[PDB]
Amino acid sequence: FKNSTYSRSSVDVLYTFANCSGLDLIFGLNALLRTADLQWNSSNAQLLLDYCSSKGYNISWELGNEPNSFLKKADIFINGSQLGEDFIQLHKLLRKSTFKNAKLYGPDVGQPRRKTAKMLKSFLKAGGEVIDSVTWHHYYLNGRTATREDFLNPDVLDIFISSVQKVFQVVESTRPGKKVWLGETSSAYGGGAPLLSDTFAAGFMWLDKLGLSARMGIEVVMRQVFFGAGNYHLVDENFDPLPDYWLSLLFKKLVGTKVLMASVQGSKRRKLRVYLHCTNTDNPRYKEGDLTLYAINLHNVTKYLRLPYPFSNKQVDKYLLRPLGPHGLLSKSVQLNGLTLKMVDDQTLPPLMEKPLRPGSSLGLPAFSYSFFVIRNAKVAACI
Amino acid sequence: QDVVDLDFFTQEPLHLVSPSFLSVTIDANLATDPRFLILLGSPKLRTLARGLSPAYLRFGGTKTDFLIFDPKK
Ligand SMILES: *[C@@H]1[C@H](O)[C@@H](O)[C@H](OCCNC(C)=O)[C@@H](C(=O)O)[C@H]1O
Ligand SMILES: *[C@@H]1O[C@H](CO)[C@@H](O)[C@H](O)[C@H]1NC(C)=O
Ligand SMILES: *[C@@H]1O[C@H](CO)[C@@H](O)[C@H](O)[C@H]1NC(C)=O
Ligand SMILES: *[C@@H]1O[C@H](CO)[C@@H](O)[C@H](O)[C@H]1NC(C)=O
């Protein structure tokens, strides 16, 4: 990595893009601009805030990316203590900026190594008080060595649970109650795994990450990347949406903010993975009290899920995602309820059509698939 | 046989995630790309982005700490 610059231009295209797309821009400032004492030099940041203010830009902030490897990356070491002080300086600047009441997230540390723990604890002791959320990074796999088996391995999915627990251990010890965000996550680091990070197979990891994040008290999950060079992109180099895009759209439509719990009876519960929220109520098909179950089947056979009492006679809308052949799980195309998902045109997304199941049927989930099930007229008071 | 019983907790919400729970990054790397302007210009791309609204968009990545703002450019 060498120093590159960027213009008032770059800022503007980025802003209008987020602005125009109904998205909330968080901007990461360069934390390697150091003074002789290796305090953060804030002069450059001042120019950018000044410009952004001048334009009336609603923007949130971060400072640094994965500070843990600054030594490997820039042959500079910065401890969490200093980095916490640096976050206080920037916070003061935002208070004196025109966006006094903008949000400030950090420190975008990599996943729980022993050293990463220490950096985050000491950063939170130091700067904990000025950040609106704690951002940390997760990847399951090295993009260079990831295999198809890895993407299908419940033993790989399950490691993420411990990751979250270690993070919540550091936070509860220093800033209990502080919201925790994943600031950058995907299947695999080094840009992703060719023919895996961009396929239907990517969706096991992605949906389970969402399931576990929501269950374990992660408030926001930031997917590396919406689009870009990396194989983990939701949209490819031709502006076509890959299966993870379709998966993200469907989740967005069906799954409410109120997080519940499902689990499977039996000592084995690793290959059949189940999550439960209140239904996204915005959806005019669905009313207050409805439940959205989503389930991942990593068995090589279909499994039939029975809803517990008193939900065993409800009308269930199925939303089952399976790959468009011939490349099965290595396919970049996906069918909902056996209809292929494609843009209608550059301007237009398709309807996402349910398949009502007969009331009282078990929920069929084929080998190597994932589905949502909306339980209609569940009348759950927690979701009302 | 391949039949599995589910247990559900429904008494109360265990968590509230953000409406922006499912959020996305643009790598800071992408601003070293010449086509950057063309790319975020794409109305197709904007359509796809609007479908994930609401969401946070994090502009950040390794290059976050190797980028310098120039008002002169
Ligand atoms: C997190 C980093 O912040 C990312 O910048 C990095 O991605 C590098 C390439 N990304 C593109 C071209 O979209 C990522 C990774 O290693 O994949 C993480 O380390
Ligand atoms: C920070 O940046 C300014 C502008 O380049 C520079 O002149 C100054 O010497 C730096 N400050 C410190 C304290 O090192
Ligand atoms: C952390 O860094 C500061 C300078 O920012 C230094 O003075 C302090 O003593 C350091 N502490 C440890 C244990 O690294
Ligand atoms: C599923 O996996 C087992 C491994 O014990 C294998 O031997 C079995 O034949 C597979 N069943 C299929 C493909 O239906």
* CATH homologous superfamily, domain A8-259: Glycosidases (3.20.20.80)
Nearest CA residue ID for atom 12, ligand 3: A79
A21 touches chain B (CB under 8 A): yes
Q: Rounded to whole angstroms, what are the CA distances from A113 to A61, A97, A291?
A: 25, 36, 37
Closest chain B residue by Cα to residue A14: B40
3 state SS of B43: helix
A213 touches chain B (CB under 8 A): yes
CA distance A213 to chain B (A): 9
The closest CB to that of A48, out of B49, B69, B73, belongs to: B69
Determine, for residues A248 and B22 on separate chains, whether the beta-carbon distance falls below 8 Å: yes
Q: For chain A, first and last CA: distance in Å?
A: 51
**In B, which residues are within 8 Å of A258 by CB distance?**
13, 15-16
* The CA-based dihedral angle spanning residues A325, A329, A332, A333, taken in that order and rounded to the nearest 10 degrees: 50
Between positions 343 and 362 of A, the ones with CB within 8 A of B are 343, 346-349, 362
* Pairwise CA distance, residues B37 & A221, whole Å: 26
Q: Rounded to whole angstroms, what are the CA distances from A30 to A87, A189, A282, B27?
A: 12, 21, 39, 14
A377 touches chain B (CB under 8 A): no
Determine, for residues B31 and A6 on separate chains, whether the beta-carbon distance falls below 8 Å: yes
Residue A206 contacts residue A223 (beta carbons within 8 Å)? yes
Of A118, A62, A59, nearest to A87 by C-alpha is A62
Instruction: Count the neighbouring beta carbons within 10 Å of the beta carbon of residue A266.
Output: 9
CB distance A89 to ligand 3 below 6 Å: no
Instruction: Count the neighbouring beta carbons within 10 Å of the beta carbon of residue A372.
Output: 26
- How many residue contacts between A and B have a Cβ separation below 8 Å? 295
Ligand 1 centroid, distance to A104 Cα (angstroms)? 21
Q: Taken in order B18, B21, B26, B27, is the CA torsion positive or negative?
A: positive
Active site residues of A: 66, 184
Q: Rounded to whole angstroms, what are the CA distances from B65 to A4, A25, A60, B20?
A: 10, 18, 17, 26
CA distance A355 to chain B (A): 21
Residue B69 contacts residue A9 (beta carbons within 8 Å)? no
* Pairwise CA distance, residues A68 & A39, whole Å: 16
CA distance A148 to chain B (A): 24
Determine, for residues B53 and A22 on separate chains, whether the beta-carbon distance falls below 8 Å: yes
**In A, which residues are within 8 Å of B8 by CB distance?**
260-262, 276, 291, 307-308, 311
**In B, which residues are within 8 Å of A362 by CB distance?**
3
Pocket test for ligand 2, best of A35, A39, A40 (most atoms within 8 A of CB): A35
- With helix as H, strand as E and coil as C, how does chain A read? CCCEEECHHHHHHHHHHHHHHCCEEEEEECCCCECCCCCECCHHHHHHHHHHHHCCCCCEEEECCCHHHHHHHHCCCCCHHHHHHHHHHHHHHHHHCCCCCCCEEEEEECCCCHHHHHHHHHHHHHHHHHCCEEEEEEEEEECCCCCHHHHCCHHHHHHHHHHHHHHHHHHHCCCCCCCEEEEEEEEEECCCCCCCCCCCCHHHHHHHHHHHHHHHCCCEEEECCCCCCCCCCCECCCCCECHHHHHHHHHHHHEEEEECEEEECCCCCCCEEEEEEEECCCCCCCCCCCEEEEEEECCCCCEEEECCCCCCCCCEEEEEEEECCCCHHHCCCEEECCEECCCCECCECCCCCCEECCCCCCEEECCCEEEEEEECCCCCHHHC
A77 touches chain B (CB under 8 A): no
Length of chain B: 73
